[PDB]
From TrEMBL, chain D:
GO molecular function: isocitrate lyase activity; metal ion binding
PANTHER family from the UniProt entry: BIFUNCTIONAL GLYOXYLATE CYCLE PROTEIN, ISOCITRATE LYASE/MALATE SYNTHASE
Record's protein name: Isocitrate lyase
Cofactor: Mg(2+)
Reactions catalysed: D-threo-isocitrate = glyoxylate + succinate
Higher taxonomy: Bacteria, Pseudomonadati, Pseudomonadota, Alphaproteobacteria, Hyphomicrobiales
Length: 397, 398, 396, 398
């Protein structure tokens, strides 16, 4: 009956998915006209295929259309769009921000739109050349950061709709207040999740919803109104000057919240500062007890000192291991940011020292990378000169 | 001293050898009734003027983003280049990937300048809040920005110049091609564009630098033969193309002719070159200097030129200092940010596909290694201003 | 063939239309994936329907989504989007501009997008209330100004696509180099028209193309290269100081240009600052001689002093008469600008004079208009408060 | 020491104003470089002058630069910028919204910039014509809606800085969680927001006015009872709702309490009200002045309130004049632009559907008739800068 309102949804896309609202609600609220969202449709269905067919899907956080394109060119199957990086350097306020939802709510979707436009141009370049594609598809699904929705359920409703028009495949939402960390009631985050599903239903796309819990670390809670949160409340503490409740953090409230969110999302993600295969299994097992086979997601922290804290062999198997535990979507949130910043610092350092010699090093690196499939050395082609040549050529009589 | 009167922040000798088509009285008519200050435009302009009259040369890289620009300034570079090609490539207001014509909206350039300056501003705020002084000479390295052909006629050039000033660009370049090989405009048409940009600078009250660029080295076409200075270069024996364009002889001769013609009307002169040649650069420099002695010159180091194959390590190594000695005081690699961004992500992504976390660890380790040489972005919260905003939060709560 | 590549095109949509490019050219340049553009299809098809079935379609230039919404609510069947107004009060440089394509080239499509979102919201409000729509449709087709395409053929390609993505139904292109008026060669404007058509084909939508000529008043021409323009050049004069050619303006070059442009557009428009049924007739009849039944468009000048220059009977019948001659799309370009500025000047004048009394005058006027279909007095409902109440209720 | 940080602040600007942060906090937090913000300086200072000099300063909600232009032209001395209107027809999400802080934080400052740019042009036009200005100043002060600050103190800190860069003169902040009816935040949470605003203005080094708004009149909910200043109004019998909100008693009493609490932390106080009543405004005015004598107040004249039905024409006629005597110095109609725009276009469109060119001719004759009262928009292309840009062209060419 919902499969009817969402034409492109594959069979059993909504297995085990509960909704607060009805099919009649969707029809009341969708408008009288059918508008299509092709990339959102394709991306979401490709993401659904991938997470069920692959060992696991790993992604990196892209700061620009160009970064995303290179990711896809290199053979990655999905793209991650990070809020931290949006705040850092890809931003509608045009400012550098800390990760606190400081930028305007339209900034994520705007990046997703940019990414898709670069992928579209890459697709057009190769299609015009007529030798076939050099990747499986240029439209690798985008999974994107919606933060806490930027307000209440309607803000989450709006931010979901915007990601859909931009052409994102999946979108994640977290149970912190945004402003260390402060949690909102379980009930409250289920409200946001439901808004996001309603938005998707209303757009007629089977967009993926990721639920994120920030309960591992958060020692604060807005309100004890929800009976499910009360076991973690240190009532004897008691409230803070801001009126927040003091809370018991760790894996146990993460498990309880994940279990509560499971019917309302397509993947579950426990935010973790400290990568640990044993904790990962712990969490996975607990969740699978109450919801067997539930798709899980995992952030591989960019600030964790990988080599210091784990042996090389464990680093090498980390993602393979996570996948076999049921973490089907894995990503490094700040990969683009680190890569961009490091690369240019080293380019700019050597250019101060030895000028044109520094750049020659870069160029020779690029040339060597061609055998591996790097093409951006042919920079005019990369950007679509030969594509617009052909356009000019077709226009002429 | 009437133009010095109107641009308060101009240093002594700023407008020496510079001719204007308008009067100071024209400025006062077109200025509005209210003085509006553009601090970053002033500061960038005066710091750029100073640097090009003191360093043996100022070199710059083309920055695709604010973070890229920051690392440039942190690394010790003194100026930032903002490339039109790169804007079209990965940073425009149509959110599209474009080839290098002028397909993107005219505001795209000035919007990047503003982005770049806002990043620098934040890096400055962070270090100022830490209270131990700056790790750089200044976070606000002057920005020299591509305006293409001005996006139409002299009024479009007027407008983009103003937009760049409000964004806090220090210098802006203008080229004598149509945008539609390359098709030049008449010499006089391009002088009109440069005058538009100076009237814009004068109306805003800023000593903003104006770079004139000539595309005559490679261009075989010219819109109109109306200008008697361009007439010698026309092959009237062709005669005109289906589009009505005139065939023209390219090379160094027309670059010299135009450059000398453009000289009284700009601050720096630039000949677009595809094949870097110290001898051909010496030619152009000398020829221009006979007509205009000590004239500031700019030079583009082609990113596509295969440096290793065409030159020797010694020639490559000396290349930039060689040009500085000739009088090429501003040198830049246009597409450096593009090549770095793209190469870096392809290699990381390739490695991450092959061996997942092992590939990230390698990048991470390289970052740690780089901290000795002055890299700080490994402390990612700090780079981005959370320590600054922590301080902001404390101050509000007493 | 081309109907295969533009799936929503009605039959005979491209009767009489020529193209420089092949169906094969489209396949190569459109990419490997099928991306749909619902609003652009629906707009294009409704407009095509309207201009063939109504006596004439008339429209006013909208400056904002609200303005557009009131047009549709009042019962107008199409919306005009004016470049002059974009320059004036609604561009992406956030500045007030004269009409010389000074603003960034994304500004028009950006407005088109605003208008379509407002109309979408208006449609959601009524759909959620569940009592049917108060209009035939909220998605009145938008005809939009692409100016001179903002450069060359590739610039025109780009702006056409952007308008299609925005949901525009038709787009107009003019043979001037705004960059008084200076014309481009006949063949150069044909190149622009062709680029716009390839953009439509590549996007897979049957978007309407209007060819505008500025030849009535223009006395300058970039180049005499095109033999079709040479009969109008005044070679004695000869060239101006910036290298332009001097041209005999008037209806004759308009006719020649219209006739040459005709196979490459869906509507032809002769730009005029002086509204005149006799001239409108001469143009139409000459064009139909070479191209029977060719759809035409007419701008009804806002600057022209209607009352002083024409009698009331003519003013009253003007659009009706134009319709009968074959002018099936008619608009007033700056209608929104004039309404907006007059309305606020007068409100602000009373408010300075007698404060709250003046607003009450406005408020009462609004209540009176409720009989004719005005709803914005219930301002909360108008903006979507009831729609979002229902959304909230659904979530909980 | 604070006056030293705000160079343009007139003497006695911050009398009776308290701050949580120190002058040293400001110095640490403002970066190492002085950036000026001229329109924000002029606008604030001018606003400050008008509210102390005029009997009262009234304003209308502008939806666009052109609307603001006509207000100034018609003789109005300030401009109000409505958050509701931004949600309606002028935001950066390019969508129509109810006002529940749904549009991106971006949008208000963007409108403020649009308006100031329109006014500059209007000023440029008249200055170029060299016959004096037809107004006291084209740069009428803008007072703008920041809503609930779009989050916490840092969001409020940021939107304040964005409004300053855009050149707003004053900025209001409300004690609701726009994010049953309205929901209030604790008294302490709002004072936090107001302080972040003051800090922002201080860090920018401008004397921007801060307006505190209370929504306690109609608000029947509160996020937390943590602040003992709010506990007198809690209905503890109720008790909490499913979102965990406390139920509260609304009206003039909590408005007075909150107003008094807010008074040291802002420049003007505004009690939001949906029922305009002179006696209640007298009530509120008196109560606040008892604790803070001669405190500047602001008043919103509800556009939704059916005025003619509910009051008599003499009361209507005198309403604003009476409030001004009570100490309501800044008064405004939030949605004036919206109602004018929508009414005008509906009626024009109605007439056009019925009688085509006859309807338009009627408008045009009205405009001609209005020329005697200072209306100039019939002159069409002058209004927009055609004459101005012709003069620029002339300076460049001939």
């Amino acid at each position: 009956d919902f499969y009817s309102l969402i034409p492109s949804a594959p069979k059993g896309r909504f297995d085990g998915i509960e909704r607060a609202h009805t099919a009649e609600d969707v029809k009341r609220l969708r408008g009288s006209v059918e508008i299509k969202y092709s990339l959102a449709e394709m991306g979401a269905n490709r993401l659904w295929k991938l997470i069920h067919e692959e060992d696991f899907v790993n992604a990196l956080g892209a700061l620009s259309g160009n970064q995303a394109m290179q990711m896809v060119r290199a053979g990655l199957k999905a793209i991650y769009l990070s809020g931290w990086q949006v705040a850092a350097d890809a931003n509608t306020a045009s400012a550098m921000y800390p990760d606190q939802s400081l930028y305007p709510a339209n900034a994520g979707p705007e990046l997703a739109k940019r990414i898709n436009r670069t992928l579209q141009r890459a697709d057009q370049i190769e299609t015009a050349e007529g030798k076939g594609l050099s990747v499986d598809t240029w439209f690798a699904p985008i999974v994107a950061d919606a933060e806490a929705g930027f307000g209440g359920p309607l803000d989450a409703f709006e931010i979901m709709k915007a990601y859909i028009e931009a052409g994102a495949a999946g979108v994640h939402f977290e149970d912190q207040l945004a402003s260390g960390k402060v949690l909102i009631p379980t009930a409250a985050h289920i409200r946001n999740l439901n808004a996001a599903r309603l938005a998707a239903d209303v757009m007629g796309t089977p967009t993926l919803i990721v639920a994120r819990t920030d309960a591992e670390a958060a020692k604060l809670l807005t309100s004890d109104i929800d009976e499910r949160d009360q076991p973690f409340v240190d009532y004897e503490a008691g409230r803070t000057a801001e009126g927040f409740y003091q809370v018991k953090n760790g894996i146990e409230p993460c498990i309880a919240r994940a279990i509560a969110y499971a019917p309302y999302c397509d993947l579950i993600w426990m935010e973790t500062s400290k990568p640990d295969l044993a904790q990962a299994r712990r969490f996975a097992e607990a969740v699978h007890k109450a919801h067997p086979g539930k798709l899980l997601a995992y952030n591989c922290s960019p600030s964790f000192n990988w080599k210091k804290n784990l042996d090389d062999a464990t680093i090498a198997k980390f993602q393979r291991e996570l996948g076999a535990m049921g973490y089907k979507f894995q990503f490094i949130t700040l990969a683009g940011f680190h890569q961009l910043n490091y690369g240019m610092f080293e380019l700019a350092r050597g250019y101060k020292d030895r000028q044109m010699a520094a750049y020659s090093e870069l160029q020779q690196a690029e040339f060597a990378a061609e055998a591996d499939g790097y093409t951006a050395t042919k920079h005019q082609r990369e950007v679509g000169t030969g594509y617009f040549d052909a356009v000019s050529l077709a226009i002429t009589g």
